[PDB]
Structures are given as C-alpha cells and as structure tokens.
Design a protein around this ligand. Structure first.
Ligand code: UGY
Ligand code: UGY
Ligand code: UGY
Ligand code: UGY
Ligand code: UGY
Ligand code: UGY
Ligand code: UGY
Ligand code: MN
Ligand code: MN
Ligand code: MN
Ligand code: MN
Ligand code: MN
Ligand code: MN
Ligand code: MN
Lengths: 258, 258, 258, 258, 258, 258, 258
C-alpha cells in the first residue's frame, strides 16, 4: 500500500486523546517538526470543498509555502495568485488535471505548473495533495514549462559521497528555481555530510522512520511527519527499522544566493 | 459585573508592590504573555481624555496592533490612519458610536469599521475598550461594511472534534481579512488539536482561569491576561476552576499566506 | 505591629486562587525559595492543638530542620528527640516557657534549649513559632544551656567591610554549634561580599523586601519568604523599598568541617 | 565633575587585562548590555580628529543609532545624511555649536538638530558626546527645530505610579518623533510597573549603580554602562548604594505604532 | 606549502566516518562556526568545472556571501550579477585573472573587482578560492577600482591597544564599503578588547588553532574553520599551539550604519 | 583483528592535536560518555609494568569500578582488596591465568574471579583488558566459583520483545550479583523498550557505531567509547553503518533493591 | 615579588564595588570557580587569632578541605582534629614551623605534617597560607613523615604526552594518599589530554592567566583564582598572556578508587 503510512501514521492523533497538550511538534528559530496532531485543517479559499492545512509559509522566513490539501467529493482547485508557480504531489487518492490534453494523476504522480499557467485539478472522490507554491523568480527571458510524471518513472542519480538513492522530479535546467527530491535510505544508512548550506527545505516523510538531527536537536520521526529547514540549519538523517525510509524534499536552486 | 475579573484581576499589580521587579509577563520569539503589572498606559494621541496601552504591534512580527483604551469622563476616540480597519470591543462601561443614527455600546458590545469609514467614539462616565487595527489588505475588488453587535446575540457555530462554544463577531465572508472569535470552555475542557498554523493571534481572557501552552512553555493564566501568538507557534489551552473560561481572539483570514 | 507582614505577606496565597499551579517557590540543587502558598501544614506529632509546616530538613542535604508552628488555644510543645537541641523564635503572639522558673516569651522572644534539656512551651491563646532543631555535635566536655532573651536586648555588632546591622541571639562560645543572626539592611544597602562558604543557612524574612541572589538565580523576595542555602551556594542580598529589611538567619559554627 | 564615573567606570577595562576573553557585555534577541571593555573606537567618518563608537544601530532591529564621540583637540563634527535628525548630549569636556549666534556647550548641555539642519560642533580640547540619529518620521506639515539646553534647567516631570525623578530634554510636541529622558532613582527605589511596551530604548547610566532586569535576565550595572531595549522587552530597574542613580534614555513617540 | 592545513585540516571530515550525525558546526542566531565536515559543494552556476560551497549568505542577516570555490582543470569563472562587487583570495593552487592587465594569482594572492567590472579567472590544473561578493553601496559619485596584490607585500599596520599583526588587503579610501584584514597572533596572544560593533564579519582560519568566544559560547578552532559574525555579537580570540594563528577577515566599512 | 577498531577508534586522540580543549566526553548527573581523548593512564598499584585508566568508580554513585589495564611486556597483575570480585575481558593481546589448571587468555576471552579467590595474570607481550571490580554482596551462604571462557562459546539467549542478539558470560544463578551481557544489533536495529530500571551499567562499544540516548541527550558513538548509566537513567540504542554493532555491558542482578 | 598577584589580583574585589551582586564565582555539581570577591574570612576553629576562608570542604563531596589562612602579628596555628593530615604552602609573608629544630618557611615554602603529628605554625609579621587537610586513609602498616621543602628545590618530572613543567611537593610513596603538584605552562601551551579521572582537585592559580574548561563550561582565570574539580569532571587548560602560568594542585593517589 504505497505511502499508506503517510496518511495513517503508527502513532496517530487519536492515540493522545488522554494526554492534554501533548505534541511531538516543535517550531524553532531555524527549523520545525510539524506532526499530525498539530495539523490545522480549514477550507482553502478559491478551492471548492477542499480542506487544506498550511504547514509552512514565508512567516517562517521561507520563500515558499507547503500545505496539505484534502480534496473531498467533486472537489476543484483554485488558482495560485499571479506569478505563483505551483507543484502538487498525490500521496493518496486520485485527481485529474486539465489546461494541452487531460491527465489522471494517482498516488506518486505529480504536476508542476509555471507561473500564471492556466490549469485545473478536478477530483471526484478524494485525494491528499502535498503542494508547494512560490513567487517565481524570473531570470532573464527563461520560462519554466509544464511537467507531469511519477517518482518511479524518474531515473536514479549520482549520489557522490553518499549512498542513499536519489530521484528528481523536475528539470535541473536553470529556468526552474526549485526542484523536488525523493531520497531513499535503507535501515542503517545515513548522511555522510552534515549539511549546512544556504538552500532551504520542506520535507515530508513518505515511508519509514529514523532520527533527524536539526542544529543541536535530535528528533525521532515516522512516516507522515513534516520538516521545515531554514537556510543554514545543520541537518542529518538516519533510517531505522525493517522497512526503508523515503522522503519528499523541497530545495531551491539556480539563483544567486545574494 | 460582566467580565469584571478582566478589569479587576484576582491577582492585581498592587499585590506585588513588595515583590520588586516581579512579573508574570514574558516576551519570547513566537509568543507573549502580557499580564496586568506590565501594561503601560499613556495619553492616546488624537483621542480625548483617554489613556491607551499597546499590547501588541508589528514590531513583534505581527501585522496588527492590539491595545487597551481606558476612556475617562467626557472622552472621545480619535481616527485610525488612512486605509486602516478598526475593531473595538467593550470590556467595561458604556460608549456611544456615531457616524448614521448614533448607537449605544455597553459591556460585551462591539463594532467593526471598514478602513477610513468615518466614525466617532464618545463616552460620558468611564469605559474600557479592547481594540484591534490593521492596514486593510484589499482583495482586488472587495470591501467590508460597518458591523455592530453583542457576543451573546451571536450564534454558536459548529466546532468539529472540538468542544468549546464558538462565536464570531464578524462575517466569514471573503471581504474580511480577519475575524474575532469568542471561545468558551468548561472546567476540565481543553483543545483536542495542538495547533500549528500560519495564522496569528492576539487574545484576551475575559472570564475564567486555566493553563495555556506555547511552544515548550506552559503558562498559568487568569482573566485579564493577554497572549500574543505569532505564526506557527504551537498553542493549546485548558480551563480550570469552578467557572467557565472565555477569551477574545483575533485571527487573520481570507488572504493567501504567500 | 512587629513582624506583622511576616505572617500577613503582601502577596498572599489567596491572591493566587486564580492561577492554577502558579507559585514563587523553587527548590534547587544548592538552595530553595519556600514561599507562603507552598507551606504544608499538618499536626505536629507530640504537640497539642498545633499545626506545623516543615520548610527544610536533612532531606535537602542540611544538618538541621526548620519549621513553623502555629500554636492555638490551649496548645503545648512536645519534647524533641534525644540528643537534639531546639531554638524557638516567636514570630507572633505569646507563649510561656517552663522547665526552674517560667518565662513569658512574646514576639521577638527566643529560647535555646540544650539537647536533652527538659522544657515545655505552653500557649493559651495563639503563637507562631519559627523553630530550629539539630542533632547537637558534642565536642569536649563542653555543654550548652538554656538561653532566653529578646532581639532588642542584644547589642548591635559591627561587621567589617559590611554595612548591615547585626545581632547574634546565642552566645559565640565554642560549645554552641550554631547561632541565629538577625540582619538589617536599609533600603538600598547590600552585601559587599559575594559570599561562598561551607556554612549552611536557613532564613526567614521578617520585614522588608529586596532581591536575593543564589547561585546564578535572582529572586524577588518579600516578608514571610523562607530560604534554604546549602554550603557554598553563591549568595548575595539587596534591600529595596521604603521600609527596611530584616531577616532571621541560622548559621552553623565552631565545628571543624573535618 | 558631573558624570565622572560615566567616563571613568569603577570596573575599568584595564582591571580586566589578566582575564582573557572576559566581558560583562551581552547581546540577546530583545536587549543588550554594552560595557566599556567592549567599546570599539574607530575614526569617525566626516569628523575631524574624532574617535567614535557605535553602541546601537538598526542592525539590532532598532530605528536609531547611538554612539559615543571622543573629540580631541581641533576636532570638528560632521553633517549627517539627508533626512536624519541628530541629538548630542555632552558627557565630558566642551564643544561649540554654531550654525544663529554660536553656543558654548559644556557638560550636561545638549542640542537637537532637525533633519537637514546645517550645524557644526567644534571642540578645541576634548569632549565625550553621546549622540542619537534617526530617519525623521515626517508627519504632515509639522516640523521640529533647533533645541539647545541643559538638564538642570529642565523641569521635573511627574509620573503616575512611580517615584523616579524625570526630565525630558526635548519638546513633547507631536512634531517630535522621540524624546530623551533623564531619570533619577534614590537608593532603594525601583520601577513599580514591569514595563512592556512597543517603545524602544537606548540608555546611558550617567551616575550610580543598580540592578537591571531585561526579560528573564538580571544585570548588575554601573555608571558608564549602555543598554539596548528592543520593543516589548520586559524591563525593570532598581538603584542601589549610597549615591543616586541617573540614566539618559532614548524613547520614540508621537507616531502610530501600526 | 603556504596554508596547507587550511586545505587539509588536522581533524579531517573522514576521521569522523564512524560518528553518525556528529559535526562541530553551529549556526546560532547571531553567529556561526562552519567546519569542513559540513561544507556542501555543488556546481557553481556560470562557472566552468568549478565546485562551490556557500558558507554565508544574506539569509543569515548578512549583506554578503562567502563561499569556497574549487576550480579544477581548465576551469573558468562566471561574472557576478549587476552591481555585485567581488573579492577573491587564493588559498591553494594558481589561477589567472584578466581585464586592466593579466596576472598569475598563487597562494596568498587576491583581487578585488569593482561593481560591473568585467574580468575572468582561468585555472589550468586546480585552485581553491575563498570569495566574497556584495551588492555595492554607491556613495555619491565615488567608485572603487581593480586591486590585485599579495598578503605578504601588505605592510604591517598600527594596532593601538592590541598586539596582533594586522594587514589590510584593500585601500581605506571611502570608496570601499569593505576591506579584508589579515590578523596574526603569536601563541598565547589574544584580543585585549572584547569587541561589540555594528561591523559584521566573515573569517577563515588560514593557519594555527586556539579558542574563539562568540557571545557566551566557546569554540576550539583549527585551520580550515570558518566563522560568521553577525553585527554586535561579542567576539574574542586567543591563539594556542606551537605555530602562530592567522585568519582572513571580511569587514564592512566607510558607510553610515543608519 | 577482532575488536581492533575499539583499540584504534576511527576518530582518535591524534586527530585532535589542533583543537585545544576539544573533547567528546560528557560526565552528567545520571550518565557519562567517556571517549579515547579523555583517558588518563597511570601505573596501576600492585600491578607490574602496566598502565591503567579508570573510567567508572563509585565516586560517580556506582557500586563498582571499571577500567582499562594496558599490560606491557613481562607484565603481571595485582589482587583486589579483601572481598572484591573481579572480571577481566581481553579486548586485545594475550595473557595467562594461573594460581586449578592454567589457561592462557586471548582476545574475546574472559574470567570471573570470586572474592579473595587468589589468582594471577602475567603477560609476556602486550595486553589490554577491561576489568570490573566490586565488593561482593554475600546473599546468605551462596558463593561464586572461578569462570573462564569466550564470547562465541556462549549460548545466544533469547530476548522477549527484542531483536539484538544476546549472550551472557556468567551464571544467572542467584549466587552472582552481576552479569556481563554482550549485545549485537544489525544496522538499522534499535532497542524497542526505552529502558528505565534500578540496574546500573558500564559499557564498552566493541564494534560498530550508532546513536545512544541517555535521558534527553543523544550521542553519536563509535567503537572504543565508554558509557556509564546510573540507575533509572533512560537509555536507548540504535546501530548504523555497514557493519554490525556490539558492546560489553555490566549489570547488577539477583539482589534486593532496598 | 614571588606570587604577588596571588594576593593582589589584577581584578580586585574593590574594583567591583559599583556592581551589586556581581561575582566571578561559580559552584556547580562537579566543579567550582571560587574568586576573591567571594572569600569569606572568619576566625579559624582552634587556630589562635587567625582569619581563614574555606574554599572547599567535604560538604561539596570531596574528601579534603582547602582554605586560606591570614596570619598576622603574634598568631598561631591550632592542631587539626585527630587523624587529620595537614599541608601548608606559603603564598605570602613567612611563618615559623616548630614542634626537631624550628624552621623558617618563606614564600614558596611548604610543610606536610603526618596525622597526629604534634606541631604548630607561629607568625610574628604576616603570612598567607593555602592549606589542605584530610582524614588520612591509613593503609596497612604504612605511615608518613614530616616533609618540608621548597618548590624551586624540587625537580622537573617526566611529563609524557605533555609540555607543562611538573613538580611534586611530596614523595610518590604508596604511603601518601595525596600529593601536591606544581604545574607551569608557557603562554600558548595547553593540556593535550582532556582528562576525565576518578582523582579530585583543589587548585590555586599562583601565576599568570588563561582559559580553563570544566565540563561544558569555559572560564577566564587570573592569579588568585581557586578551582574545585570533583571526580570525573572533564578538565582542560591553556595559559595565555606575556607571563607564564603556574598553579598549586591537590591530587589524591595511592589508594584503591573503589
Ligand atoms: N536535509 C537533506 O536531506 N538535504 C538534502 N540532502 C539536500 O539538500 O539535497
Ligand atoms: N488559540 C486558539 O484558540 N486558536 C483557535 N483555535 C484558532 O486558531 O482557530
Ligand atoms: N547570606 C547571608 O545572610 N550571609 C551572612 N552575612 C552570613 O553568612 O553571616
Ligand atoms: N525601562 C525604563 O527605563 N522605562 C522608562 N521608565 C520609560 O519607558 O519611560
Ligand atoms: N574578530 C576580529 O578579529 N575582529 C577584528 N579585530 C576587527 O573587527 O577589526
Ligand atoms: N542499555 C542497555 O542496552 N541495557 C540492556 N538492554 C539491559 O539492561 O539488559
Ligand atoms: N586538571 C589538571 O590540571 N589535571 C592534572 N594534569 C592532573 O590530574 O595531574
Ligand atoms: Mn539539505
Ligand atoms: Mn489558533
Ligand atoms: Mn552567609
Ligand atoms: Mn521603558
Ligand atoms: Mn571585529
Ligand atoms: Mn539497560
Ligand atoms: Mn586532573
């Protein structure tokens, strides 16, 4: 059951009904671990019959927003503001995209929509979407293009110095100001480089469990957890248990960090 | 009297006159607990024979200001700068609202005022208002309209997976970029979801006592207390004692969090 | 009235009936700040119509006990275990000491009873006793004896490099293994030496208010507060306000630490 | 000589030459304690033979700059950028203000220059000047003007609820976006209100010593010390010793905090 | 080889291959210690066959960028954006710079390039460069000019109050909004002044080792380490070991801090 | 060689010669992590030509000692004071046991010596062993016998609710008050129960590397590290890397906790 | 004047008289930094007319006491309790030792007296003695003897793995259960091993200044400073400045650490 654990985490919110105030969530100066018992769902404007929960916004200091969209019966999507690029990823259910030709996106599929590119996502039953939105940073006369596909369909890439498996969802072309990485770790595998860089992250754990290190903090995590990594926060991960770990990742690229 | 412990708190400033520099007030990175012994009142500009005490201003990262106005005899309110929406809530006493057909606002009464909408607040004896102001965020081709009412004359809304009785002094319409909630709790009741949302709050405890959690901090609170909650700060509350707890709450809405 | 606020503190427990869990009390590794709303009163074994509250006992690492005894109509004191000396200071009310004569100990009156010294304190109306007990550390063929006097009848002692007024209740003779000091500070005066010594303390603030520094902590204190000071806890004090400060203080002496 | 310890602290930088890396200075999120052994003097741009040291600049989130100007012989002041108002207070030595009849400014003297107001400070011997500069907040037609004077000749203002003696160096007119206060505390006195306000500060302790509370931090202070107070930082002060306390204080006013 | 350790740290990143997640790197609110096991290299845009690792960017609250650039065979640089000034220092290898003229830069050689000044770096074998870039702050009608030199050809400068040996790679004329200092400490030497200034820093320990204090933090440092010093953070260094300590240091200057 | 990495940790003291004062060791209230760069070797009393270093003694609160004896050429051992049971475990080299029989002990070989049980240890070449000495608690008439062995020659015991391979070196029979568990985890495997018990530990990681949790502190560890776990200190382990993970563990058993 | 700064420290107690509550002293769970402004001089028990200030006693968990003796005109020592060994070191002045023939002990001189060894130190001018006392841990039939010497007359000892110059005032015989090391560091030198041993210390920096690490605490120190290091606390040092560093050091040896 692909990404099942992501929408049905082992430690579920209802399990803390007799533990008032308790939460695994934390929000600090340079990072954050947002968990299922803290998601605040509420109707998404311009969207039709869709409860959405924002996990990250520029108020945190980011240049993107990362939210979860719960599309229920005969739901439709609203358009991002002007000059806002959007990326959706289906983690549960099914949704159909329409502008050049129709597309039926299911679990593990995804779509990238450039700024002001007209489109619409129409869902008949339900679909859990983890979407990233950003004010597109126009470089020269470059323009991004529509992108559609699936994680499994993407090729494995060079992971010099590392051992985790890496897939990328978007073109690395200079026009794209960000990308989405899918990283896989086998139990016992970790990051050799204790990353400290100007790039910022938005991460969703799709499968597995392990320990994430953020700054001087150590956080045991499980599929379903979300993470906000501000630029320059020391970061690291290690997968644990019997099943492997898989996480979806946001990362800004191709722009002078000045 | 209605909301008497808000203006005459069980533990008052005069009760600490022998505990040098002692205060319950805390101003942290993502939140604040402003207790009565820290309130700073100074002549409120343009107003008349009225002292004001700013509790929250954008200097904290918010996008709004919160202050207590203590109107004295033969007093009158001043006007907000240009393009600024204002909202007053009567915590004690009486005050007349003129534009028109003048209106009489008493304890638990209130009024919203579109940005610029010319209005005048005039009071005879005394009166103490809790007020919010924020530079309106014009949603393209939308506008709001003068609102007036009394908490009690507001219907109890639906609160799924939550017990507290909710009321909203303003319309959930798109025009409005913020609302004002009235959440009542019964001794022993708390918030089931440990919230983490882009939304920000400014809240006044009118009745009751309980425990508020903010980030990894827990704070015993009594009526009269005011809390500042910045975007994404984990929050939670539980009412205690014999009476019920109820607080005033500003919450930003109907605007993209980008 | 003398030592009035000592039993009627500015901030009283009832003033906190609306702040669940709130408390000024703090019990740390090398010290403690016991305040009114934490006093645990229970009937004093071997006593009559007398509730007692223990503030410090060797469970803290000390070598003595400190406690308050609220005596009431027709009440009497019980004989302290074998080989244990006792010192009683009358905070309020009246009590009669018998044994070889019988003195009428009133407010500001004290009595040191040697170990195994038959005696009895008997209160008819009501008395508040602050008392110290310790296993006496027998030296040579030295032995102590009954001491009965009043603070005002003790000469002011000069203390080099310090500006506080000092009175020592018991004789400085080698035989006594401790002494009770009375220390007065005028508003604005403070300890010039930032003490760090093997000596351990137990103190009760009878009058005034100020800042007490213990270790790396700063505590606002008012009359009625009690403090535990384990050996070597860095300590300092400053008197604030209109009125002067006065605290009763236990201090072990004349015994070689080896 | 007036404010002698202000430029000759009891605990001088020299006394610390056998303690590598030691400093009393601290810089936190909402406040700062800048002490002598931390001042970094550098030649002051556009000034003649004048060493300067910036203690506070907008890099802290403030809207004003605060610096010390050590003027030696034949030294001259330097005009500030466009739209910047300047306030100079003489702490040691003497300088001549010329622009409307030259003026000799000595210790305790001060001058306020409206933005874009041509002037010149010429010194022939030496002089220490504490100066504040800001981007004036033009409010309609209102405009400030040259203000020369002395603290002694300024009237003792009254402050409800407090006992400290206050004087405000500049007019309270709405045109002025801030004032400079002088506050006196007799030993044993302290602030009654545990201030928490939108206003921000920058201060210089000219005389005396005491304890300053900032947030949950406590700092013993002495003449010569400088403090930064960010908006909404919990603040409290107490004077101690034989001599009285005196500190210069910056404070913004007459401008909507919204 | 000059600066050999700065390229081959005593404690190399691989020495830590059996310590999962362990790193000596810290990114605090007002400073940062970036070490080798955390460096993140990636294809430097617009460059040719050169890996880069940004250490500091305006995302930390700075106004500049600092990055290590690993130029391999037949490698060439890329031009910075409009108005971005640039400074490069050779810590390893050799590279050629061309217009006005052309020079062969080897270890210890540097070149400052004014805004929009067309240039180019070309390396045949390998080179390691530490570089700083910044949005130039045009002051009036002034302009900077090409500066190419060698650390050793720079004269020792007077360090009033200090004992280290300071060189400045760039001129001090008002046109330059920054400079790069070279600071040498003999073993056991340290900074007498415990700096607190608006100037922000970017350093690279070229050789030696010792201790660095940043705020209330203390860090053992070795050649290769990199430190970020945001404005006003208290700073201090002491050199230890057999050999001397040398560190490259950026510093903003000749601009009003308002 | 076996356990080689333990005697030659990947991160060794030599790698730290350029980081003054730096050390990975931590000694806390309820636990400790002793690393190779903090070992203090001194000639063991009674022993012959043999450097020894104690890692855990009762000064820490334990009721046992643990140390590393590094027997050199022609070395011999000394006996434990009256009633001090002793267990040795060869970590590297060779040494012969004597006195019944006379078997030469080698790497991965151990020996329990009953209290007073006369014995000897002579090493011809080199030897490094880890020993545990303690005051035996006679439980009536029961008594311990000599024991010699090897790890692999020990039955892999079961472990209800666990995955780590377990082996004990001594009889679980009541006569013994302490055992020496051996534990093995495969990369990605971890303790399922966050242990909290009266028992105390003294461990040596012989192989692997992972993350150890002690209370609220997490520690990246590697072969050769040493940990002390006082009673009730919350503990947890997880192995990482390509190789397995194993450690030697002390543990009091079969005795009333009162 | 040998060790002049040891009783006339650069940062003197009187330099901090305008800083109420300020002190450099610290006292924690495993260590302590006792500075001059905290010395509590008070009549020494048994001694005749001599002020003394205890720095360390077993109350801290140690097995020895450390204290300063201020002897003046005609003032003499008092035999210590029974079975207590004493060691005195002359830091200032001179004192005569008698009991075999009298001996004049000047600065840098010392005397170790066995337990019960009758004797007496008398003074006719002035002298500052740093003394250590402990309840001698008799072992078998071993006994100690009157030791009298002088630092300079003691030989440098082999310091493998180090560079500091070491001297031991007492014989290394298994009889002595403690020794007093003299350790000298040249500017820049430091400990290579970050010790963590069962041994305990009581040190007194006699000459110079530097940085001292204890646990995760970093401390600047100067001549006259006194440090207490409890068993197993991480400890390191580094000498800084123009002049060398030297400190006296108590260290227990020759006894099973069980
Ligand atoms: N925290 C991370 O996992 N970061 C990724 N390795 C990345 O930035 O590519
Ligand atoms: N603090 C609160 O009461 N928050 C509300 N539950 C809200 O944000 O809707
Ligand atoms: N803290 C104190 O009260 N100290 C007293 N001066 C004392 O130890 O005598
Ligand atoms: N902290 C302060 O000194 N506050 C001043 N009394 C003031 O705000 O006026
Ligand atoms: N950290 C430093 O070394 N700073 C330099 N002394 C400087 O700012 O000039
Ligand atoms: N820390 C440990 O691994 N403890 C073992 N599981 C044990 O006590 O058996
Ligand atoms: N902290 C110390 O100075 N330790 C000494 N080197 C010692 O234990 O010998
Ligand atoms: Mn990353
Ligand atoms: Mn909320
Ligand atoms: Mn004391
Ligand atoms: Mn203020
Ligand atoms: Mn600097
Ligand atoms: Mn265990
Ligand atoms: Mn040591």
């Amino acid at each position: 059951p692909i990404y099942w654990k992501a929408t049905n985490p082992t430690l579920s919110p209802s399990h803390l009904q007799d533990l008032p105030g308790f939460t695994r969530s934390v929000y600090k100066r340079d990072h954050a671990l947002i968990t299922p018992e803290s998601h605040v769902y509420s109707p998404l404007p311009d969207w039709t019959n869709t409860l959405g929960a924002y996990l990250i916004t520029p108020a945190t200091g980011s240049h993107f927003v990362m939210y979860l969209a719960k599309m229920k019966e005969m739901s439709s999507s609203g358009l991002p503001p002007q000059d806002i690029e959007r990326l959706i990823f289906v983690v549960e259910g099914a949704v159909t995209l329409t502008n050049s030709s129709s597309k039926k996106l299911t679990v593990d599929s995804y779509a990238y929509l450039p700024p002001n590119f007209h489109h619409s996502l129409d869902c008949v039953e339900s679909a859990t979407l983890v979407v990233f939105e950003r004010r597109y940073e126009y470089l020269g006369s470059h323009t991004t293009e529509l992108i559609v596909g699936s994680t499994d369909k993407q090729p494995l890439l060079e992971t010099p110095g590392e051992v985790f498996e890496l897939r990328k969802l978007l073109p690395m072309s200079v026009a794209y100001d960000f990308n989405i990485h899918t990283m896989d770790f086998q139990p016992g595998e970790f990051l050799n480089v204790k990353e400290v860089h100007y790039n910022q992250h938005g991460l969703l754990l799709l499968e597995g469990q392990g320990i994430y290190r953020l700054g001087d903090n150590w956080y045991p995590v499980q599929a379903g957890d979300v993470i906000w990594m501000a630029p320059f926060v020391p970061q690291w991960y290690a997968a644990l248990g019997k099943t492997r770990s898989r996480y979806l990742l946001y990362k800004d690229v191709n722009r002078n960090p000045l």
